Design a protein around this ligand. Structure first.
Ligand SMILES: *[C@@H]1O[C@H](CO)[C@@H](O[C@@H]2O[C@H](CO)[C@@H](O[C@@H]3O[C@H](CO)[C@@H](O)[C@H](O)[C@@H]3O)[C@H](O)[C@H]2NC(C)=O)[C@H](O)[C@H]1NC(C)=O
Ligand SMILES: *[C@@H]1O[C@H](CO)[C@@H](O[C@@H]2O[C@H](CO)[C@@H](O[C@@H]3O[C@H](CO)[C@@H](O)[C@H](O)[C@@H]3O)[C@H](O)[C@H]2NC(C)=O)[C@H](O)[C@H]1NC(C)=O
Ligand SMILES: *[C@@H]1O[C@H](CO)[C@@H](O[C@@H]2O[C@H](CO)[C@@H](O[C@@H]3O[C@H](CO)[C@@H](O)[C@H](O)[C@@H]3O)[C@H](O)[C@H]2NC(C)=O)[C@H](O)[C@H]1NC(C)=O
Ligand SMILES: *[C@@H]1O[C@H](CO)[C@@H](O[C@@H]2O[C@H](CO)[C@@H](O[C@@H]3O[C@H](CO)[C@@H](O)[C@H](O)[C@@H]3O)[C@H](O)[C@H]2NC(C)=O)[C@H](O)[C@H]1NC(C)=O
Ligand SMILES: *[C@@H]1O[C@H](CO)[C@@H](O[C@@H]2O[C@H](CO)[C@@H](O[C@@H]3O[C@H](CO)[C@@H](O)[C@H](O)[C@@H]3O)[C@H](O)[C@H]2NC(C)=O)[C@H](O)[C@H]1NC(C)=O
Ligand SMILES: *[C@@H]1O[C@H](CO)[C@@H](O[C@@H]2O[C@H](CO)[C@@H](O[C@@H]3O[C@H](CO)[C@@H](O)[C@H](O)[C@@H]3O)[C@H](O)[C@H]2NC(C)=O)[C@H](O)[C@H]1NC(C)=O
Ligand SMILES: *[C@@H]1O[C@H](CO)[C@@H](O[C@@H]2O[C@H](CO)[C@@H](O[C@@H]3O[C@H](CO)[C@@H](O)[C@H](O)[C@@H]3O)[C@H](O)[C@H]2NC(C)=O)[C@H](O)[C@H]1NC(C)=O
Ligand SMILES: *[C@@H]1O[C@H](CO)[C@@H](O[C@@H]2O[C@H](CO)[C@@H](O[C@@H]3O[C@H](CO)[C@@H](O)[C@H](O)[C@@H]3O)[C@H](O)[C@H]2NC(C)=O)[C@H](O)[C@H]1NC(C)=O
Ligand SMILES: *[C@@H]1O[C@H](CO)[C@@H](O[C@@H]2O[C@H](CO)[C@@H](O)[C@H](O)[C@H]2NC(C)=O)[C@H](O)[C@H]1NC(C)=O
Ligand SMILES: *[C@@H]1O[C@H](CO)[C@@H](O[C@@H]2O[C@H](CO)[C@@H](O)[C@H](O)[C@H]2NC(C)=O)[C@H](O)[C@H]1NC(C)=O
Ligand SMILES: *[C@@H]1O[C@H](CO)[C@@H](O[C@@H]2O[C@H](CO)[C@@H](O)[C@H](O)[C@H]2NC(C)=O)[C@H](O)[C@H]1NC(C)=O
Ligand SMILES: *[C@@H]1O[C@H](CO)[C@@H](O[C@@H]2O[C@H](CO)[C@@H](O)[C@H](O)[C@H]2NC(C)=O)[C@H](O)[C@H]1NC(C)=O
Ligand SMILES: *[C@@H]1O[C@H](CO)[C@@H](O)[C@H](O)[C@H]1NC(C)=O
Ligand SMILES: *[C@@H]1O[C@H](CO)[C@@H](O)[C@H](O)[C@H]1NC(C)=O
Ligand SMILES: *[C@@H]1O[C@H](CO)[C@@H](O)[C@H](O)[C@H]1NC(C)=O
Ligand SMILES: *[C@@H]1O[C@H](CO)[C@@H](O)[C@H](O)[C@H]1NC(C)=O
Ligand SMILES: *[C@@H]1O[C@H](CO)[C@@H](O)[C@H](O)[C@H]1NC(C)=O
Ligand SMILES: *[C@@H]1O[C@H](CO)[C@@H](O)[C@H](O)[C@H]1NC(C)=O
Ligand SMILES: *[C@@H]1O[C@H](CO)[C@@H](O)[C@H](O)[C@H]1NC(C)=O
Ligand SMILES: *[C@@H]1O[C@H](CO)[C@@H](O)[C@H](O)[C@H]1NC(C)=O
Ligand SMILES: *[C@@H]1O[C@H](CO)[C@@H](O)[C@H](O)[C@H]1NC(C)=O
Lengths: 326, 172, 172, 324, 172, 325
C-alpha cells in the first residue's frame, strides 16, 4: 500500500508545448507566443533567372528599339521570338542617334507583339537613289546603316516627289517603322537631297501621320550634327498604306508582324541560370508557392502579390505556456 | 473564445507526448500511462489544411503590367502611373495585415474550444461517477485499471456496473 | 463545430420537422409530444434578416466611367487604363471572398450557440434531477405527464413539488 | 407500454436531405440546409426604358450626329441620359478624322445635350453653304448640317477678322474644323491661293492649325480629308478667328452643362420594365450585390467579380438524414 | 457568439461601480459588501490597449499626390484622374465599415464570454456543496462569512472543511 | 429576516452598466446599446494651417508659375525654399499674358522640386539688344519685364543667326526655361526683328524641342494682343545645351536647381497661424490620432485615409441592459 489507497488515478490532462516557439501577432495582442508558425512572405532570391517555362531572350547590351531598327551590334536578333525581354543597363548604340516622341509607347507595343518576323516588301523607287550608306555607322568593318530602314537620297541631281503605296491583302496586321532625317546644316540638305524645303504626308483610311522635317544644329554625337526621328504606323487588313514625300524620308524595307501574346519587357542585369520557376523578378527568379512577397514590385507571370510588410506569421498550433514560471 | 483553458485547467502541462497534440495522463496503482486521442487531432489538422490550401497553389497570373521604374522625370503621365502604383500596394499591405490577424485569432479560439469539447465529452459519459478537481483532473471515485481505457472511448462503456461503488466511497 | 454540437452531441438530424428550427421531443406512456420553441428561433431569423438588410438593397451610384473595350491599339495611355480596371476587379474579387468566407464561419458558430444555450438552459431548471446519457437526451427520473412540457417550454418549472419524489426514487 | 420512471427528453435541430455546397474557411464542400446566390449570372437580354431615357443609335455614331450627317438628320436637338452606339454603324459621306477622338466623344457624352441656337457671324467677301458631291440629300448635293463649308468668292480672298463674344452665364462649345485638300489644283479651285494658315484664340487658351497638302487614299472617289477641332468659351471671354483658306466655318455652339449622362456601347434592343442597372448584355436586377455579366455598366449597379458563384450559408450545419 | 447574452438568465447589474468592470455580492448577517477585482482586468484591458495600438500611432505618410480638383474640363487624361480617385475612396470606405463591424462583434462576444468563463470557474471550485439558483446566483446551503468569501476571490478554497455540514442540508 | 438568513447565503454575479447608451453598428443587431464607444473619424477642424513643422509658403496674390517667371508682385519669392506651396484663388497676373503647353507638367515639376535657387550665368549675346520693355507691365512704379527672362530685340537693322552653347561642368540637374514670342500684328514683328519668318530650336544630347511662332490676331488683354508660350528643358550632367533661333526667343537668364524631396503644392484659402500639427488639408488642419477622416480627399503629410461616412463607432464594452425590466 504505497499511499494510493485505491482511491483515484486523477485522470489528468496535458498538451503539446515547445519551449522555443515563435511570436505571432493578432487582433487581441501582438506578443503572443505560439508553438509553431510559418511565414507567408518569401524574402529571398536565388540570384539567377531561369527560363524553363518561358522563353527568355537575353539583351546582350541591346535594348528593344535598336533591335527593332537593327544596329550592327544586334545582328543576331533578326527573326526571334520571346516570352520576356530583358534589357541590360550597359546598353549603347554604335550607329546614328535615333529619337522618337513617346519612346515608351513604341517600346511597349513592340514588346507585346512578342516577335520580330520581318518580310522584305517590293517597291518601285524610280529616280531615287536607294541603299544609303554612312561612314560613322559601321557594319562588318564597312559603312552601312540600319538593317530595317533605307536612307533615300537624290538620283543625279533630281528628287521627284514619291507617290507610292502598298496595299495589304493578308489577315495579319502590318507594322511599319519609318524615319525622317533632320540634317545639321543646309549644306547637307543640298548635298543629300538637292532640295531646300521638304515635308512628309503619310495617310491611311483611318489616321494621318504627317510630320515636318525641321532643320537645325544639334550637339555632335560621333562627329555628326544630324538626328533621325522615327515614327510608326499600323495598317489594318482592310485599308492600305500611302507614302508621299518631297525630301527627308527614310522609308522602311518592309513590314513587321504584330500579334497578341503573353510577352512583356523588364530591366535587369542578373545572369541566366537553369531551373524551373514561373516567376521572374529583376532581383531574380523566386518560388511562387507563397501568396505574398516583398522581393520586388516588378512582376511577370504567377508572381505573388507585393506586400510592404516584411514578416507575416500564420499560427499553426496553440498558445504555449511560459513553462516553469508560474 | 479562450474559455479559460491555458490559464485555467492546465497548470503548466508537460512538454512531452509528441505522438499527439492532446492526450490523457493517469497515475494508477500499477504506474503511469499515456494515450493520445487521434480523432480530435485530425479534426484540427483538416482545418489548417483548409486554411493553407486557400492561399497556396492558387496564385493569379499576370503578363503585361505597366512600367514601375522611371530614370527620368516626366510630366502628368508619370505622376499618374506612380500614384496608382503606390495606392495599389497600400491597399494590399493593409489587406495582408487584416488577413493574418483574423485567421490567427480564429485558430487560437478553435483550438481552445477543441479542448473544451473533449472536456465536455468526457464528463457527459460519467453521470455521477466523477468530480472535477478544478485544474484538469477528474476524480474517478471507483476502482479502475487498464480495462477502463479501451472501454471508455471506443463505444464500449457501461456505467451501471460501476455506479454502486461511487455512492459508498463519495458520501462515506 | 466550435461548441461541438454536431460530432457527438446530437449525432443525427431530424428530417420530418419542417415547421420549426428548434424543437422538444419526448417519449412517455402518453405519446410523442413534439413541440417547437419560437422564442429561440426569433433570435436567429432577426439576425439573418438584419445582416441581409445591410447587404441587399444597397447600391452604389456610378454614371460615367472610362472606356473598357478598345478596337484600336494605342501606347502607354491604353495600357494604363487597361491596368487600372484590372486592379479594381482583383481587389473587389478578393473582398467578395472574405465577405462570403467570414460570415459563413460566423453563422455556423452562431447557430451552435443557440443549440448550446438551449441544452444548457434545461440544466438550470433541473438542478440535480437530470443527467445526459451520451446522445443529447436527458433522463428526468420522475413522471412527466402533460403538465411537464408546458412548464419546460414556458420556463415555469418549479422543482420544490417534485424534489421529494425524484431524489427518493433515484438513490434508494 | 412504457414505465413512468423511464421519461426522457431529447433535443436537436432540423435538416433537409437536399443540401447545397457552400465555400468557407473550414472546407470548400460543407453542406448547408439552405443557401442563396449572392451574384447575378444571368441577364434579360435587352435594355429597359423607364427610369432613364436611352437614345437609340440607329446606325449612327455620336460624332456623326454631332456634325449633322445627312443619314443621321433625325438626331437634331435631342437630349439623352445614356447614348448607345451600334457596332454595325457606318457612314457614307465626307470623310472625317479628329485628333483626340476619345476626348471629343467623352465630353459631349458627359453633358448629354445637343441644344443649338443659330448665331449670325459677320461674313463678307466669301461664299457660304459650300456643298460636295460625296454626300447626297434628297437627290442633291449637301454637307454637314452644323458646319459651313467655305469656298472662294471671285479670284480673291479677304483678310478675315471676325469674332463672336459671349455674354451669357453658361459655357459654349464651338465646333470648327480644318479642310485638307488632295491636289494642288483643288487648292486653287476652292481658295485661289498657294497655302493657308488658321489660328483661333480665347482669353485663356489658343489653338493653331496649319493645313497640309497631299494625296490620301481614295474614299468614295475623293481624296480630301477634314479634321474637326473644338474649343470652350467661358463667360466673359471672347472667340476670335483670323485665317485664310481651308477654314470650316462653325454654324453655332453646343450647350455644355454638368449632368449624369454617359455613353455605352451595345447591340441589344430596347425594352419596357422598371430595372435600373444597364449593361451591354442587358438589364440586370440590383438585388444581387455582385455581378459578372460585364464590367461596363451605367447607373445604380452592383460590383463586378470574376468568380462564377458565391454561396452564403443561412442555416446551421446540415446532417444528411441518418447514418443509413 | 452571444454566450450568456448578459440578459435573461442574469439580470440588471449595479450602476454604482466606478472602480471596476466586474464584482461580487453576498448575503449574510453582516452586510451586502461588494467590491471589484483586478484579476479579470488583466485579461480585459490588454485587448483594448492592443486594439488601439495598431490604429493610433501607426500611419503611412504621403508627400506628393495627384491633382483631384479641376477648374477646367479636359479629355481622357482628366477622366482617368477622377476614376482612380473614386475607386481608391470607395475601397477604403468598404474596408472601414466592414472592419468596425468585425471588431465590435468580436469585442462583444469576448466580454460576454468573460462572465460565462468565470461562472464555470466558480462551479468547478464548488463541486457538490453548492447549487445554481438559476437567476444568476449561487445557492450555498451553509453559512459562509467574510473570511469564507475571501477564499473565493483568492481562487484557493478547500471543500473538505465545509463538506459535512453542507451535504446534510442539501438532501435532508 | 434574521431567522431565514442562518443557512441561506447567496452569491450572485453582475457586470458594469450605464444609464446612457451608445448605438454601435455591427454585423448583427445594428441597433444595440453599448456602454462606451470611441470615435474613428474626426470631422472637426480649427480652420487655420499649423506652422511648427517644415515651413509653409503663403500665396499672397501670387501662384507658383508667376513666382517662377519673376512677376513684380511675386518679388518676395526670390530663392525661397518651401515644402508646401499654397495657392489662393484671388491670385492674378497683370504683367504680361502667357500660356503654357501641358500646364500640369510644369506645375508639378516645380512643386516637386520645391526650390528656386536661381544662379545667373554668363552668355555671349552679340548683335542683339536685350532687356525688352513693355509699358503694360509696371515694376516698382516703372516699366519693366520678367526678371528671369530676356526679351530679345534687334540691333540697328540686323538680327544674326544665334548659335550659343552652354556646357555643364557640375553633377546636378538644371532646368532651362525658354519661351517664344507670338506678336499680334505683322507690323509689330517686322518692327522688332526685321524678319517676317522665325524659327526657334533647342537641342540637347537626349531630347530636342522645336516650335515655330504662329502669327495672327489675338484678343487684347490690358492693351496688348501678343502671347508667349513657355517651354522647359531638363539638362542632365555632361550634356551640352545648344540653342539656334532667328527671332522671337525669350532667352533664359539662367537655370533653376532641382532637388528630390517631399515638397508638393496645395490650393486653399485658410489663413496661416502659429500652432502644432502634422497633417495639412485645404480646409485646415486635423490631428492624426484617428485612422480615418471625411473632411477632404486632398491631404499632405501624415494624414488618415478618406472615408465616405458620416461617423464610425467602435464598441469598447458589453451590451447594456435596458434596466427596470
Ligand atoms: C554651333 O555651335 C556648336 C557648338 O560650338 C558647333 O559645334 C562645334 O563644331 C565645331 C566645328 O566643326 C567642332 O569642332 C571640331 O570637333 C572635332 C574634334 O575632334 C574635329 O572635327 C575638329 O578638329 C573640330 O575641332 C565642335 O566639336 C562642335 N562642338 C560640339 C560640342 O560638338 C556648331 O558647328 C555650330 N554650328 C554651325 C552651323 O557652325
Ligand atoms: C504629294 O504627292 C504629289 C504628287 O503629285 C506632290 O505634288 C507635286 O509636288 C511637287 C513639289 O513637291 C510639285 O512640283 C512643283 O511644281 C511647280 C511647277 O514646277 C513649282 O511650284 C515647283 O518648282 C515644283 O516643281 C508638283 O507640281 C506636284 N505635282 C505633280 C503632279 O508632280 C505633292 O507635293 C506631295 N506632297 C508632299 C507633302 O510631298
Ligand atoms: C432559403 O432561404 C431563402 C431566403 O434566404 C428563401 O427564399 C425566399 O423564400 C420565400 C418563401 O416565402 C419567398 O417569398 C415568396 O416568394 C415568391 C415571390 O415573391 C412568392 O411565392 C411569395 O409572394 C413570397 O414573396 C422569397 O421570395 C424567397 N427569397 C428569395 C431572395 O428568393 C428560400 O425559400 C429558403 N429555402 C427553403 C427550402 O425554405
Ligand atoms: C498618288 O497615288 C495615289 C494612290 O495610288 C493615286 O490615287 C489613285 O488615283 C487613281 C487615278 O485617278 C484612282 O483610280 C481611279 O479610281 C476610280 C475608281 O472608281 C475611277 O475614277 C477611275 O476608273 C480610276 O480607276 C485611284 O482610285 C486612286 N486611289 C488609289 C488608292 O489607288 C493618286 O492619283 C496619285 N496622285 C498623282 C498626282 O498621281
Ligand atoms: C490676320 O489678319 C490680318 C489682317 O487683319 C492678315 O494680314 C493680311 O495679310 C495678307 C497676306 O496674308 C496681306 O496681303 C498682302 O498685303 C500687301 C499689300 O501691299 C502685299 O504684301 C501683298 O500683295 C498682299 O496683298 C494683307 O494686306 C494683310 N492685311 C492687313 C490689314 O494688313 C494676317 O495675314 C492674318 N493672319 C492669319 C494667320 O490669318
Ligand atoms: C471609454 O473608453 C475610452 C478608451 O477606449 C476611455 O478613454 C480614456 O481617456 C482617458 C482620458 O483622456 C485616457 O487617459 C490618458 O492618460 C494619459 C495620462 O494622462 C495620456 O495618454 C492622456 O492624456 C489621457 O489622459 C485613457 O487612456 C483612455 N483609456 C482608458 C482605457 O481609460 C474613455 O474615458 C471611456 N469613457 C468613459 C465614459 O468611461
Ligand atoms: C479683329 O477684331 C477684334 C475685335 O473687334 C479687334 O480687337 C479690337 O481692336 C480694337 C482696335 O481699335 C481695340 O480698340 C481699341 O481699344 C483700346 C480701348 O482702351 C484703345 O487702344 C483704343 O481706343 C481702341 O478703342 C479693341 O479693344 C479690340 N477688342 C478686343 C476685344 O480685343 C482686333 O483688333 C481685330 N484684328 C485686326 C487684325 O484687325
Ligand atoms: C542655325 O544656325 C546656323 C549658323 O550657326 C544658321 O545657318 C546660317 O544661316 C544664315 C541665315 O540665317 C545664312 O546666311 C545666309 O547665307 C547665304 C550666303 O550669304 C545667303 O542666303 C544670305 O545672304 C545669308 O547671308 C548662313 O549662310 C548659314 N550658315 C552659316 C554657316 O552661318 C541656320 O540658319 C540656323 N538655323 C536655324 C533654324 O535657326
Ligand atoms: C510547423 O508546421 C508546419 C506545417 O504547418 C511544418 O512544416 C511541414 O514539415 C513537414 C515535414 O515535417 C513537410 O512535409 C511539410 O511540407 C511542411 N509544411 C509546410 C507548410 O511547410 C513544420 O515542420 C512545423 N514546425 C515545427 C517546428 O514543428
Ligand atoms: C532587389 O533589387 C532592388 C532594386 O531593384 C533592391 O532594392 C534596393 O536595394 C538597394 C540596395 O541594393 C537600396 O539602397 C534601395 O533602397 C532598395 N530599394 C529601392 C526601392 O530602390 C533590393 O534590395 C533587391 N533585393 C534583394 C533581395 O537583393
Ligand atoms: C456579355 O457581353 C460580353 C461582351 O460582348 C461577352 O463577352 C464576350 O463574349 C464573346 C462571345 O462571342 C467572346 O467571344 C468574348 O471573348 C467575350 N469577351 C470580350 C471581352 O469580348 C459576354 O460573353 C456576355 N455575357 C453573357 C452572359 O451573355
Ligand atoms: C472644404 O472646403 C471646400 C471648399 O470651400 C468646401 O466646399 C464643398 O466642396 C464639395 C466638393 O468637394 C461640394 O460638394 C460642397 O457643396 C462644397 N460646399 C460645402 C458647403 O460643403 C467643403 O465643404 C469643405 N469641407 C469641410 C469638411 O469643411
Ligand atoms: C556587346 O554585345 C556584343 C554582341 O553580343 C558583344 O560582341 C560585345 O562584346 C558587347 N560589349 C561589351 C562591352 O561587353
Ligand atoms: C515606277 O514609277 C514610274 C514613274 O511613274 C512608272 O513609269 C513605272 O511604271 C513604275 N514602276 C512600277 C513597277 O510600278
Ligand atoms: C543629270 O543631270 C544633269 C545636270 O546637268 C543633266 O544635264 C543630265 O541630263 C541628267 N541626266 C539624266 C540621265 O537624267
Ligand atoms: C439605319 O437607321 C435608319 C434610321 O432608323 C433606318 O432607316 C435604316 O434602315 C438603317 N439602316 C440599316 C442598314 O439598317
Ligand atoms: C460687320 O462688319 C462690317 C465690317 O466688316 C461692319 O461695317 C458692319 O457694321 C458689321 N455688321 C454688324 C451687324 O455688326
Ligand atoms: C488572499 O486573501 C487574503 C485574506 O484572506 C487577502 O489579504 C490577500 O490579499 C489574498 N491574496 C493573496 C495573494 O494572499
Ligand atoms: C441619460 O442619463 C441621465 C441620468 O441618469 C437620464 O436622466 C437621462 O434620461 C438619460 N438619457 C437618455 C436619453 O435616456
Ligand atoms: C562670342 O563668340 C565669338 C565667336 O566669334 C567670339 O569671338 C567672342 O569672343 C565671344 N564673346 C565672349 C564675350 O565670350
Ligand atoms: C545700320 O544698317 C544700315 C542698313 O542700311 C547700314 O547702312 C548702317 O551702316 C548700319 N549702322 C551700323 C552702326 O551698323
Amino acid at each position: 500500500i504505497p499511499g494510493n489507497d485505491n482511491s483515484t488515478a486523477t485522470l489528468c490532462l496535458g498538451h503539446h508545448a515547445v519551449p522555443n516557439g515563435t511570436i505571432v501577432k493578432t487582433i487581441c495582442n501582438d506578443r503572443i507566443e505560439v508553438t509553431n508558425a510559418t511565414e507567408l512572405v518569401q524574402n529571398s532570391s536565388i540570384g539567377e533567372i531561369c527560363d524553363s517555362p518561358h522563353q527568355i531572350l537575353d539583351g546582350e547590351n541591346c535594348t528593344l528599339i535598336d533591335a527593332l531598327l537593327g544596329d550592327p551590334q544586334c545582328d543576331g536578333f533578326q527573326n526571334k521570338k520571346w516570352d520576356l525581354f530583358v534589357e541590360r543597363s550597359k546598353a549603347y548604340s554604335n550607329c546614328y542617334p535615333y529619337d522618337v516622341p513617346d519612346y515608351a509607347s513604341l517600346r511597349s507595343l513592340v514588346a507585346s507583339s512578342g516577335t520580330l518576323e520581318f518580310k522584305n516588301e517590293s517597291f518601285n523607287w524610280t529616280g531615287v537613289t536607294q541603299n544609303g550608306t554612312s561612314s560613322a555607322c559601321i557594319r562588318g568593318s564597312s559603312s552601312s546603316f540600319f538593317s530595317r530602314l533605307n536612307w533615300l537620297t537624290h538620283l543625279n541631281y533630281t528628287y521627284p516627289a514619291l507617290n507610292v503605296t502598298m496595299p495589304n491583302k493578308e489577315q495579319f496586321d502590318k507594322l511599319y517603322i519609318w524615319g525622317v532625317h533632320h540634317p545639321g546644316t543646309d549644306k547637307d540638305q543640298i548635298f543629300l537631297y538637292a532640295q531646300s524645303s521638304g515635308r512628309i504626308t503619310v495617310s491611311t483610311k483611318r489616321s494621318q501621320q504627317a510630320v515636318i522635317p525641321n532643320i537645325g544644329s544639334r550637339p555632335r554625337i560621333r562627329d555628326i550634327p544630324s538626328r533621325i526621328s522615327i515614327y510608326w504606323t499600323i495598317v489594318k487588313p482592310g485599308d492600305i498604306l500611302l507614302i508621299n514625300s518631297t525630301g527627308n524620308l527614310i522609308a522602311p524595307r518592309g513590314y513587321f508582324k504584330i500579334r497578341s501574346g503573353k510577352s512583356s519587357i523588364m530591366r535587369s542585369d542578373a545572369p541566366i541560370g537553369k531551373c524551373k520557376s514561373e516567376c521572374i523578378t529583376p532581383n531574380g527568379s523566386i518560388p511562387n508557392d507563397k501568396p505574398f512577397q516583398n522581393v520586388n514590385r516588378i512582376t511577370y507571370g504567377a508572381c505573388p502579390r507585393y506586400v510592404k510588410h516584411s514578416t507575416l506569421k500564420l499560427a499553426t498550433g496553440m498558445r504555449n505556456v511560459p513553462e516553469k514560471q508560474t | 473564445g479562450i474559455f479559460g483553458a491555458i490559464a485555467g485547467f492546465i497548470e503548466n502541462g508537460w512538454e512531452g507526448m509528441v505522438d499527439g497534440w492532446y492526450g490523457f495522463r493517469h497515475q494508477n496503482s500499477e504506474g503511469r500511462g499515456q494515450a493520445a486521442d487521434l480523432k480530435s487531432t485530425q479534426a484540427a489538422i483538416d482545418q489548417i489544411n483548409g486554411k493553407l490550401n486557400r492561399l497556396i497553389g492558387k496564385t493569379n497570373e499576370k503578363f503585361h503590367q505597366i512600367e514601375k521604374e522611371f530614370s527620368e522625370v516626366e510630366g502628368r503621365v508619370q505622376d499618374l502611373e506612380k500614384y496608382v502604383e503606390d495606392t495599389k500596394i497600400d491597399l494590399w499591405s493593409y489587406n495582408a495585415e487584416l488577413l493574418v490577424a483574423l485567421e490567427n485569432q480564429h485558430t487560437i479560439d478553435l483550438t481552445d474550444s477543441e479542448m473544451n469539447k473533449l472536456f465536455e465529452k468526457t464528463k457527459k459519459q460519467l453521470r455521477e461517477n466523477a468530480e472535477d478537481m478544478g485544474n484538469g483532473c477528474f476524480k474517478i471515485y471507483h476502482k479502475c485499471d487498464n480495462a477502463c481505457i479501451e472501454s471508455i472511448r471506443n463505444e464500449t462503456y457501461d456505467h451501471n456496473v460501476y455506479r454502486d461503488e461511487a455512492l459508498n466511497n463519495r458520501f462515506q
